């Protein structure tokens with residue numbers, strides 16, 4: 001009755017919604033449920049900005065599961081304004097509702113509360129119906145090393161600045177996980193991975209959403225050691241118009257945007273890797289030595305479809 | 321050439337506007353500027369709230385002179401929204417009694433981040449003023465902390481408590497029994513950069529008709545500042561903030577009562593005193609129809625309503641004239 005999912009980004013929040021729907025948790029609860037959902041949430045995008053601490057993935061899971069996301073925009077609060085952002089532009093340097101979260105979190109961190117407890121405190125308001133554990137209570141911020149065009153020097157940029165400003169506009173060389181080597185697995189993270197009935201890798205971006213969770217010392221070891229089946233979900237959805245575009249962050253590490261490539265990225269637990277099973281969308285193929293591969297529908301069209309997706313993860317692992 | 325004015329918030333900014341219109345400064349600039357206006361701004365109301373630093377007096381002048389102030393509120397931005405404040409309420413956090421506007425919050429965020437990175441307030445203020453272009457030099461009385469505290473009888477328990485000015489003013493609206501003010505940090509605060517010099521090199525120094533106990537007073541509590549006023553060669557002209565028989569914006573009467581000073585122009589004048597003896601004033605202007613005696617102080621009844629920048633401009637002229645300054 002214990003399921004733990006590693007997540008990052010909007011897609012992670014959507015996958016958790018499916019988990020909740022299948023198991024009657026959170027918004028989808030009819031009576032008190034038989035299951036506990038634990039999310040090990042990416043902190044690689046977290047940043048100090050404008051004197052306040054911003055944790056996008058933890059916030060996106062919290063708001064999404066708490067039913068606070070705007071149905072028509074898909075991101076951000078309902079009836080959001082960006083007046084504070086507007087004045088910040090005028091000052092020459094982030095919704096208003098979003099800022100309140102930031103002020104509260106910042107006040108807690110500066111008063112000594114670790115992020116895990118900041119998160120629990122915010123979740124008393126949102127009541128996501130899930131345990132959202134930050135991968136780490138220490139800093140571990142995903143950066144991108146570019147060739148800077150002012151002087152030609154390699155520089156590390158915060159992933160967030162890279163994504164808006166520099167992506168596809170200057171040469172990019174690698175990712176750096178700033179602070180990761182000095183970070184420890186956040187409270188409960190190794191325990192949540194060790195005691196689970198099943199561990200699911202959400203179909204988030206493998207490099208910058210699941211990937212940085214894996215750079216936290218202790219987390220990768222937990223995954224290799226745990227007796228819970230580990231089932232990963234492919235993030236590659238073929239069949240789009242013009243056959244889609246390759247993933248920009250997989251490009252940075254020279255990894256093809258195929259279910260086969262992302263699968264080899266995580267690799268087989270039978271070997272040095274992390275996966276016992278690997279789900280791909282129907283019509284897609286992957287053969288990976290040691291890894292059970294199955295094509296099923298993998299579109300998170302709504303919680304009902306994601307619930308089917310989660311159900312197929314249990315079945316491949318053989319978990320009830 | 322050089323005018324230095326001690327100011328609070330809404331009233332100091334309003335008086336400062338009069339200075340600007342009289343001299344063709346800031347928003348009122350019509351051709352080459354012949355004058356330099358320096359404001360020494362009260363920092364006694366400054367407070368940390370929700371993890372961000374609030375400087376209401378500096379902000380209100382900054383917003384007012386820069387054409388951003390809320391016309392009917394007198395504090396905070398025009399067309400302000402309060403969604404961020406609303407969300408703080410929804411999270412159930414404290415204090416829920418202090419209005420952090422969404423537009424206003426950006427100032428607080430930029431200011432808080434710069435101070436935390438070691439920038440002194442004076443530099444934060446100049447930086448913020450590059451966007452607003454107030455047309456005046458807004459000097460914090462000090463780059464160090466000097467916050468007015470209020471000794472009340474707390475209505476929860478009947479106990480004596482000290483509260484920050486913000487809680488006295490915003491939460492209780494000065495309606496709790498009030499016993500004294502403490503200028504916590506003033507004796508340890510150094511006069512801000514340029515403040516003593518602006519007082520010394522001024523052709524004239526003007527005390528805006530701001531709140532005497534909680535707006536001008538706390539400036540005068542910074543050790544360096546009071547000496548500059550006494551030791552300066554520029555005449556010091558004060559404006560009574562009390563228009564006897566006419567209630568005015570703010571709680572000046574309540575603040576005067578705490579320090580046991582009658583709400584009359586003569587009493588406020590004597591509060592500040594005469595430079596001939598132990599005081600600070602050379603001159604002291606009051607509203608027409610008001611009589612005031614101050615030994616050592618030239619007192620002149622003149623119109624004293626800040627109804628508009630043109631009317632205030634005349635008020636400024638009457639100080640120059642009483643000082644004998646051109």
Ligand SMILES: Nc1nc2c(ncn2[C@@H]2O[C@H](COP(=O)(O)OP(=O)(O)O)[C@@H](O)[C@H]2O)c(=O)[nH]1
Nearest residue numbers: 008009010011012203204205209235298299300
């Ligand atoms: N398999 C699968 N992957 C998806 C679906 N929707 C989105 N994704 C993947 O989710 C990734 C983006 O999600 P995420 O890592 O959470 O970061 P985000 O950019 O903030 O949304 C994309 O690279 C997609 O490949 C879906 O329905 N199925």
Ligand SMILES: Nc1nc2c(ncn2[C@@H]2O[C@H](COP(=O)(O)OP(=O)(O)O)[C@@H](O)[C@H]2O)c(=O)[nH]1
Nearest residue numbers: 328329330331332529530531535570572625626
């Ligand atoms: N003489 C005079 N004083 C005024 C007038 N309008 C407001 N005041 C005074 O100015 C004070 C407010 O200025 P200040 O203390 O800087 O504003 P605050 O800090 O925002 O309260 C009030 O307490 C009033 O007594 C006016 O027209 N004439």
Ligand SMILES: O=c1nc2n(C[C@H](O)[C@H](O)[C@H](O)CO)c3cc(O)ccc3cc-2c(=O)[nH]1
Nearest residue numbers: 329365374375376379395417418419420490
């Ligand atoms: O009465 C109020 N005055 C508010 N003021 C005015 C200020 O608190 C006091 O009027 C001054 O301290 C005294 O003049 C603010 C000033 C700021 O710079 C920033 C925020 C506020 C918020 C309030 C408020 O919520 N209620």
Ligand SMILES: [Ca+2]
Nearest residue numbers: 238239240241
């Ligand atoms: Ca298609």
Ligand SMILES: [Ca+2]
Nearest residue numbers: 328329365377
């Ligand atoms: Ca004030």
Ligand SMILES: [Ca+2]
Nearest residue numbers: 464508509510
């Ligand atoms: Ca000091």
Ligand SMILES: [Ca+2]
Nearest residue numbers: 503506507541
């Ligand atoms: Ca004293």
